Amino acid sequence: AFDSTWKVDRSENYDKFMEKMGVNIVKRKLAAHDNLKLTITQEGNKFTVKESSAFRNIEVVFELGVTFNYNLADGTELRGTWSLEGNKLIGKFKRTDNGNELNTVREIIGDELVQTYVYEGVEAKRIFKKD
């Protein structure tokens, strides 16, 4: 349940979602073809999450309920919270570049971390397999 190495298998509508966020064709196609390995480690309420990719290796220490600037694969600065609700880690974010809302639902379907990303009202569903 969550605390393990999760790598991206299949990314569904993510270049359309990133076209509504305002990002260039080179960076937008590399954020679809990204190779993102998320190793989630529990620290003391906090989650120390090692985010290993073709762009960057970033260790993100988030507390359950804290308002922080989260950054994705290329360049998207998100002020907001990771909150635990009924299995699911709920990413309630908004762009500190804009004002617009971004909703990232982290959930385990058996042995797959399936991230549903909603910007304004546009769905993109990234399926992460175990390593």
Curated annotation (Swiss-Prot):
Tetradecanoate binds at residues 82, 106. Its main location: cytoplasm. Expressed in the small intestine and at much lower levels in the large intestine. Highest expression levels in the jejunum. GO terms for cellular component: apical cortex; cytosol; microvillus; nucleus. Hexadecanoate binds at residues 82, 106. The keyword Acetylation applies. PROSITE patterns: FABP. GO terms for molecular function: fatty acid binding; long-chain fatty acid binding; long-chain fatty acid transmembrane transporter activity. The modification N-acetylalanine is found at residue 1. Pfam families: Lipocalin. It is found in: Cytoplasm. Keywords: Acetylation, Cytoplasm, Lipid-binding, Transport. Gene3D superfamilies: 2.40.128.20. Induction: By EGF. One of its GO terms (biological process) is intestinal lipid absorption. Forms a beta-barrel structure that accommodates the hydrophobic ligand in its interior. FABPs are thought to play a role in the intracellular transport of long-chain fatty acids and their acyl-CoA esters. FABP2 is probably involved in triglyceride-rich lipoprotein synthesis. Binds saturated long-chain fatty acids with a high affinity, but binds with a lower affinity to unsaturated long-chain fatty acids. FABP2 may also help maintain energy homeostasis by functioning as a lipid sensor. Belongs to the calycin superfamily. Fatty-acid binding protein (FABP) family. PANTHER family: FATTY ACID BINDING PROTEIN (PTHR11955). This is Fatty acid-binding protein, intestinal. The gene is FABP2.
